[PDB]
Design a protein around this ligand. Structure first.
Ligand SMILES: [Zn+2]
Ligand SMILES: [Zn+2]
Ligand SMILES: [Zn+2]
Length: 572
């Protein structure tokens, strides 16, 4: 009730009652907000509303001060002052961008652009507002009731009439009813219960909507440059394996925070784990937004770090299966691996935040609020996939607008850049280096002569809105009969419906481009499926082709990306 202005920090009893987050506003900023937007409800201890009985005047521009009470133009006493006048709204202790964040629906790319170009406090107001909007939007959907249960990984659902049906993919995690979280995939659909329970007919599901907590800490702490490695104690017995990263681990101790751009297979996990061998006495908290990203840090630490000082923090509401080799929930072990949502209230000598393109500004702020560290390291790549923006339907979100860290990496450049790709055949490295890394990524492997491209538009069908291209899967089927070594390939496509069809027709294991991020496979078979802005996204294309160690087959729809692929072309 007695707070600080989310724009100029001036203390005030004023708050905007029309803002979903009800931000505290000072007299100067409250005025400029109410006179420029549809937001006219001002709240303090008592709201600014006509105190005359039965009067429904809540607009602060149509209200006055009747001694110590508030009344409209039709009820005010002779001696009464307008609440709104002289560039201020009457309050104790007597912006174009704030207005846009406050009133937008978050469906345009320009909303997210502003949420990252604004001041630091407006980045937090934007991140809070956006998340509150995303959760409340979930409430507006239709309930799925289990009509029948065929088998253990198959069922038929009945949907609510008059309310939209959400897209069935592991993107949307439904809460079953209180029989745990479940997911769906294609009238034969597949049910995926995080908690195993004999699929009860009649029992319904409802979308997971969690409470948006206020943000206190900034997305990025104020940068500090030090003259010497501060609060960290390095070794002289640094193993040759991590010798290449020594000069950068030193940079990490001479800065409050540091950014690392690591293209696919340049050694991000290796760099993060090697930083623990360089500052061996330092307590390191390893974080990321996904469980799979934290598990990739756990797999790398298992090899170089002592398994006794390692703890994988698992939230009590254990959703899907994760890393099982460290002592679970020991917050005090020297190395703590944990997702951002599960981060306990603790301190560290170094905090390593991996897969930074997947972080939102809400996540950047949570980390600064739960972990007080001497040094913060942000590892990732703005040329890879960002976190899905469910409300965004108009415009394309650029990497410099994913979050504060990506904005920095794309504007002033990253502090550190891992320039040599050790995973991919040179054909893949040469293609993505020119596409998203302005020729700064270098190939370590030779050309494998196992990277192929085929131009085939096929036939695009649609399962609600996820696309299928059966003739492209047919081309893969014909390729596999001629190249049976490719039987050990992972099938990748931008759509789960294409993946669902290819799983039944080819029998290859399946992965969408988005779920393949961070993983590597000897052979990849990619069917673009469509030429949409989704399937043509350069970050998604980059992730797709950089999953392969040995060979890749790309069946393309877009002439542009097909011509850009530095692969052997195949006929048929
Ligand atoms: Zn102000
Ligand atoms: Zn407002
Ligand atoms: Zn009135």
């Amino acid at each position: 009730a007695v707070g600080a202005c989310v724009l100029c920090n001036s203390q005030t009893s004023l708050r905007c009652g029309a803002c979903i987050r009800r931000p505290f506003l000072c007299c100067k900023c409250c005025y400029d907000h109410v006179i420029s937007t549809s937001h006219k409800l001002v709240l303090s201890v008592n709201p600014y509303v006509c105190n005359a009985p039965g009067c429904d005047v809540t607009d602060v521009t149509q209200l006055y001060l009747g001694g110590m009470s508030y009344y409209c133009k039709s009820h005010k006493p002779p001696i009464s002052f307008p609440l709104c006048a002289n560039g201020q709204v009457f309050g104790l202790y007597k912006v174009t961008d704030f207005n846009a964040i406050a009133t937008c629906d978050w469906t345009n790319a320009g909303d997210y652009i502003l949420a990252n170009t604004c001041t630091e406090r407006l980045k937090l107001f934007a991140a809070e507002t956006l998340k509150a909007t995303e959760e409340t939007f979930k409430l507006s959907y239709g309930i799925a009731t289990v009509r029948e249960v065929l088998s253990d990984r198959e069922l038929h659902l009945s949907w609510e009439v008059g309310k939209p049906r959400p897209p069935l993919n592991r993107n949307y995690v439904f809460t079953g009813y209180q029989i745990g979280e479940y997911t769906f995939e294609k009238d034969a659909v597949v049910y995926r219960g995080t908690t195993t329970y004999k699929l009860n007919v009649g029992d319904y599901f409802v979308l997971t909507s969690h409470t948006v907590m206020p943000l206190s800490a900034p997305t990025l702490v104020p940068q500090e440059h030090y003259v010497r490695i501060t609060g960290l104690y390095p070794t002289l017995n640094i193993s040759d394996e991590f010798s290449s990263n020594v000069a950068n681990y030193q940079k990490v101790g001479m800065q409050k925070y540091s950014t690392l751009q690591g293209p696919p297979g340049t050694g991000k996990s290796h760099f993060a784990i090697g930083l623990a061998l360089y500052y061996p006495s330092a307590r390191i908290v390893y974080t990321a937004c996904s469980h799979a990203a934290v598990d990739a840090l756990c797999e790398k630490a298992l090899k170089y770090l002592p398994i006794d000082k390692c703890s994988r923090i698992i939230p009590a509401r254990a959703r899907v299966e994760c890393f099982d080799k460290f002592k679970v929930n020991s917050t005090l072990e020297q190395y703590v691996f944990c997702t951002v949502n599960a981060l306990p209230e603790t301190t560290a000598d170094i905090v390593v935040f991996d897969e930074i393109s997947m972080a939102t500004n809400y996540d950047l702020s949570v980390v600064n609020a739960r972990l007080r560290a001497k040094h913060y390291v942000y590892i990732g790549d703005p040329a890879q996939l960002p976190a899905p923006r469910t409300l965004l339907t108009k415009g394309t979100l650029e990497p410099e607008y994913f979050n504060s860290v990506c904005r920095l990496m794309k504007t002033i450049g990253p502090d550190m850049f891992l320039g040599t790709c050790r995973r991919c055949p040179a054909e893949i490295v040469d293609t993505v280096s020119a596409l998203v890394y302005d020729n700064k990524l270098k190939a370590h492997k030779d050309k494998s002569a196992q990277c192929f491209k085929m131009f085939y538009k096929g036939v695009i069908t649609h399962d609600v809105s996820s696309a299928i291209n059966r003739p492209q899967i047919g081309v893969v089927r014909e390729f596999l009969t001629r190249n049976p070594a490719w039987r050990k390939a992972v099938f990748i496509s931008p759509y789960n419906s294409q993946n669902a069809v290819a799983s039944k027709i080819l029998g290859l294991p399946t992965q969408t481009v988005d779920s393949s991020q961070g993983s590597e496979y000897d052979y990849v078979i990619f069917t673009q499926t469509t030429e949409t802005a989704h399937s043509c996204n350069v970050n998604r294309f980059n992730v797709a082709i950089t999953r392969a160690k040995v060979g890749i087959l790309c069946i393309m729809s877009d002439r542009d990306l097909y011509d850009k692929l530095q692969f052997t072309s195949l006929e048929i």
